[PDB]
């Protein structure tokens, strides 16, 4: 025998939950209706419950029992004991949403099974119906099933709805007077003029040739973000140990020659500065470091979710770097593996509504050209890195290639791509000794 699906216990829980708290009435009502139940007495109880709610009567055991007794359905549904047992088996009212969702699923399956039986009945006996009519009934029934869903899957949306949401967003952006920095503050005012901060739900990328300052720049962004807001910032350092990263940060924030720090030849003033930096960092306590190696996209997402849940959300996450992550399922094709990683990082940003800064390496074809500034098509193994990214910043230090360059200690942030915004170049002073990028106070050179 085949028993049509149903969840009596879930039906009990949904009925039981609302009697304690009625505030969740809309949640249950919109999700499910009295037609979703499989047992008739439960349908009677909910029908009574809806009537009482529509009458303004509070949803409770006493009101339900009174209504059933007056209507005479109390005997059919049981009584004080039966209705008391209804609430007794409810695990928690807060979960009622899942119980309601379960009830909807059981009803949907029952609806589908009934349609299948109706289709089988029509097919077995034409009853004068031709083949074409049987197709029409199947099409009509299928459309009804897709119609009864009431969306639940984000189908095509009219333009009137989209305009209402978009104009609301613009209006609220008007009120807050941030004056340029809509997203996370980068710390370099010349960079904010173009990027307007690191926007949430973005996949930012920082790329450059080895030993160009790729991890030095990203850490500067992380330090500035941590000190200029209150949300946690998460760092995935797959390339270097946590101690080496912190040794650089002390040198940058306290502006002490990192050679002394790494070697231990520190003076009194250097100890004073480092003590000052330590006090500030321990006052905020919103930086997290994870130096595990060869993480898969699943492990990255899981750990980021836990930090967000525990501390009320994330403000920024940095990955160092993209090509070191692994997808064991796709290991035969490196091109597919990199494409999968890039897609996952973009999806994670959307889910948590946070900017993701993922570093990347560059091809060697750059080094066979007369001009050695990077371009979009130099990203290593980059199938879709150029396509998924919403902003791409390249680090270029001309002094590395031409010894007699006039730009000695002047790095360039070349914005190679920006989906919503202009592109250009920004010049920053590079103090390698302190492992820092500073604002270029010198005369502004117009970008061509």
């Amino acid at each position: 025998l085949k028993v049509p699906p149903h969840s009596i216990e879930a039906e009990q829980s949904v009925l039981g939950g609302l009697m304690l708290d009625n505030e969740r009435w809309d949640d249950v009502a919109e999700r499910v209706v009295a037609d979703d139940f499989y047992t008739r007495p439960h349908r009677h109880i909910f029908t009574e419950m809806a009537r009482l709610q529509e009458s303004g009567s509070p949803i409770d055991l006493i009101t339900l029992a009174e209504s059933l007794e007056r209507q005479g359905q109390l005997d059919s549904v049981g009584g004080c004991a039966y209705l008391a047992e209804l609430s007794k088996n409810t695990p928690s009212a807060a979960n009622i949403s899942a119980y309601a969702d379960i009830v909807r699923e059981r009803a949907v399956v029952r609806e589908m099974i009934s349609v299948a039986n109706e289709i089988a009945e029509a097919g077995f006996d034409p009853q004068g119906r031709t083949s074409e009519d049987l197709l029409d009934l199947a099409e009509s029934r299928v459309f009804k099933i897709a119609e009864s869903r009431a969306n639940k899957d984000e189908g095509p949306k009219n333009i009137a709805d989209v305009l209402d949401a978009t104009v609301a967003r613009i209006e609220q952006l008007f009120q807050q007077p941030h004056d340029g920095v809509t997203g996370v503050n980068t710390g370099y005012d010349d960079l904010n003029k173009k990027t307007a901060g690191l926007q949430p739900s973005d996949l930012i990328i920082v790329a450059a040739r080895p030993s160009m300052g790729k991890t030095t720049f990203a850490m500067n962004l992380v330090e500035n973000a941590a000190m200029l807001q209150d949300k946690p910032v998460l760092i995935f350092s797959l390339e270097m140990p946590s101690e080496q990263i912190m040794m650089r940060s002390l040198a940058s924030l306290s502006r002490v020659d990192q050679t002394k720090i790494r070697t231990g030849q520190l003076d009194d003033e250097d100890w004073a500065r480092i003590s000052g930096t330590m006090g500030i960092l321990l006052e905020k306590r919103n930086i997290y470091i994870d130096d595990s190696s060869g993480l898969t996209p699943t492990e990255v997402r899981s750990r980021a979710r836990r930090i967000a849940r525990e501390h009320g959300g994330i403000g920024l996450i940095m990955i160092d770097y993209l090509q070191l992550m692994r997808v064991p399922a796709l290991s035969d094709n490196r091109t597919l593996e990199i494409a999968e990683i890039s897609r996952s990082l973009k999806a994670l940003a959307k889910e948590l509504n946070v900017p993701v800064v993922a570093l990347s390496q560059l091809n060697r074809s750059l080094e066979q050209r007369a001009d050695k500034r990077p371009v979009n098509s130099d990203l290593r193994e980059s199938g879709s890195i150029e396509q998924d990214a919403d902003l791409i910043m390249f680090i270029y230090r001309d002094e590395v290639y031409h010894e007699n360059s006039d730009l000695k200690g002047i790095a360039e942030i070349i914005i190679g791509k920006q989906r919503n915004g202009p592109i250009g170049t920004v010049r920053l002073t590079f103090n390698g000794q302190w492992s820092r990028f500073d604002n270029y106070a010198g005369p502004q050179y117009d970008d061509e």
């Binding site: 304690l20 006493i62 029992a65 004080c80 004991a81 008391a84 047992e85 609430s87 007794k88």
Partner: protein, 133 residues
């Protein structure tokens, strides 16, 4: 079961028995082996500040001592505060069982001859504790 764990916590941490409310108000037969637990609490209250070995020494000549020794060996937790919390929430669980048994009896009386307004109203109040969370 949560019964065996209680004595194990009782034997391993004798001082926990000090904060145990009286149980003679209820029939000891309601729970299996409940009388012994109440026996231990009064025994602890008889000589407050007793060693763990002394507590088991009080029942050296009894046959049930073997069960007490096995429970002491089982579930050895170095932390003391966690054990106290486990004992406290467990004690709440037994009180829930007592109320659960009561309402089951009250349901039984309902089937026998029904209930009045006060009785079913009291039953309704008896469900909050079982759904306090």
């Amino acid at each position: 079961t949560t019964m065996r764990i209680l004595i194990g916590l009782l034997v391993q941490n004798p001082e926990l028995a000090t904060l145990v409310p009286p149980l003679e108000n209820l029939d000891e037969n309601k729970l299996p082996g409940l009388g012994l637990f109440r026996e231990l609490v009064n025994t602890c209250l008889s000589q407050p500040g007793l060693t763990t070995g002394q507590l088991l020494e009080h029942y050296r000549g009894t046959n049930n001592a073997a069960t007490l020794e096995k429970l002491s060996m089982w579930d050895d937790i170095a932390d003391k505060n966690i054990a106290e919390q486990t004992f406290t929430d467990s004690l709440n669980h037994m009180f829930d069982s007592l109320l659960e048994l009561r309402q089951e009896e009250l349901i039984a009386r309902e089937r026998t001859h029904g209930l009045s307004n006060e009785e079913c109203l009291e039953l309704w109040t008896l469900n909050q504790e079982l759904a306090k969370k």
